[PDB]
Amino acid sequence: GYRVEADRDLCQGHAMCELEAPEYFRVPKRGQVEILDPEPPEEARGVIKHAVWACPTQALSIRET
Ligand code: F3S
Ligand SMILES: [Fe+3]
């Protein structure tokens, strides 16, 4: 039970999140990051932390619900 949060004022479009977890983050060429699942399964928490770590602006975050 967690939610993937994106500080959209901080996303500069590096698209490192899509390279680390492509199933859960998609970045349009002309758009910022799009969170495909806001409430992903518990098995996906590992690959999503990769995207949180790999964001140079730290726009992504995991919030426990
Ligand atoms: S800048 Fe944006 S495109 Fe992803 S790697 Fe960080 S949330
Ligand atoms: Fe890992």
Author numbering: 2 to 66
From the paper:
Ferredoxins are small iron–sulfur proteins and key players in essential metabolic pathways. For catalysis, CYPs required electrons typically supplied by redox proteins, such as ferredoxins. Interestingly, two Mtb 3Fe–4S ferredoxins, Fdx and FdxE, are co-located in respective operons with cytochrome P450 (CYP) enzymes suggesting their functional relevance. Here, we explored the genome context for two ferredoxins, Fdx and FdxE, determined the binding kinetics between FdxE and CYP143, and solved three crystal structures: Fdx, CYP143, and a complex FdxE–CYP143.
To obtain a structural insight into a single 3Fe–4S type of ferredoxin, we determined a crystal structure of Fdx at 2 Å resolution. The observed overall fold is typical for the monocluster ferredoxins with two double-stranded antiparallel β-sheets and two α-helices. The structure contains four reverse turns: A, B, C, and E. Turn D is not evident in Fdx forming a loop. Turn C (residues 29–33) forms a rather noticeable protrusion from the surface of the protein. The protruding turn is adjacent to the iron–sulfur cluster and considered to be important in specific interactions with ET partners (discussed as follows). The [3Fe–4S] cluster is bound by cysteine residues 12, 18, and 56. The His15 residue does not form a hydrogen bond to S2 of the [3Fe–4S] cluster (distance of 3.6 Å); its side chain is turned away. Two main differences are the absence of turn D in Fdx and the position of turn C. In the Fdx structure, turn C is additionally stabilized by the interactions with turn A residues: backbone Val34 with Arg9 and Gln33 with backbone Cys12.
